[PDB]
Amino acid sequence: GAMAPSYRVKRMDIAKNDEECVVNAANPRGLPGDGVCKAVYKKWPESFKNSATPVGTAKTVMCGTYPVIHAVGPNFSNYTESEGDRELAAAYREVAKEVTRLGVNSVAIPLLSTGVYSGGKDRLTQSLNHLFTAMDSTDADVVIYCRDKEWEKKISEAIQMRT
Ligand SMILES: [Cl-]
Numbered sequence: 001g002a003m004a005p006s007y008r009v010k011r012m013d014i015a016k017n018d019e020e021c022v023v024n025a026a027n028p029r030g031l032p033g034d035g036v037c038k039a040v041y042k043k044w045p046e047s048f049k050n051s052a053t054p055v056g057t058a059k060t061v062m063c064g065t066y067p068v069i070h071a072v073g074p075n076f077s078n079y080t081e082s083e084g085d086r087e088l089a090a091a092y093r094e095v096a097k098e099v100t101r102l103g104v105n106s107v108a109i110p111l112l113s114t115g116v117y118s119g120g121k122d123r124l125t126q127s128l129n130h131l132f133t134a135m136d137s138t139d140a141d142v143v144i145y146c147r148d149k150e151w152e153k154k155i156s157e158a159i160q161m162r163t
Pocket residue numbers: 011012013016
């Protein structure tokens with residue numbers, strides 16, 4: 001475990017993280033994809049061997065000894081708000097199980113279903129609150145990665161509000 005488990009947020013490419021493992025915002029088919037998924041494919045392509053997994057699940061594949069946790073959030077273009085909310089919560093619950101099983105002291109994590117799976121909505125708060133619900137009982141240092149300057153400020157505010 002981390003000596004004083006924390007949350008932090010950085011605005012940068014998750015492929016350059018300083019943590020002991022990474023969460024990919026994966027598609028269910030293990031394809032290179034776009035956005036976070038394509039950056040993860042360029043950095044850790046070996047981790048996409050048999051990485052296909054259903055919506056609401058996470059599947060870990062090692063790139064050398066570095067764990068890539070492929071977490072499949074729902075595409076809100078296809079899911080109802082209700083069913084999508086359930087699957088997005090479930091994906092983060094499976095990430096917490098994997099992070100615990102791996103015994104890492106730190107994890108780099110993107111906000112699932114906030115990009116091309118958002119069905120054109122702002123889901124910062126929805127996705128971040130499901131991240132917290134899952135990860136609060138873990139003792140890993142969690143570092144959240146984002147690319148937008150206003151999202152960095154809002155994520156940082158939400159972290160500091162609880163402290
Ligand atoms: Cl960067």
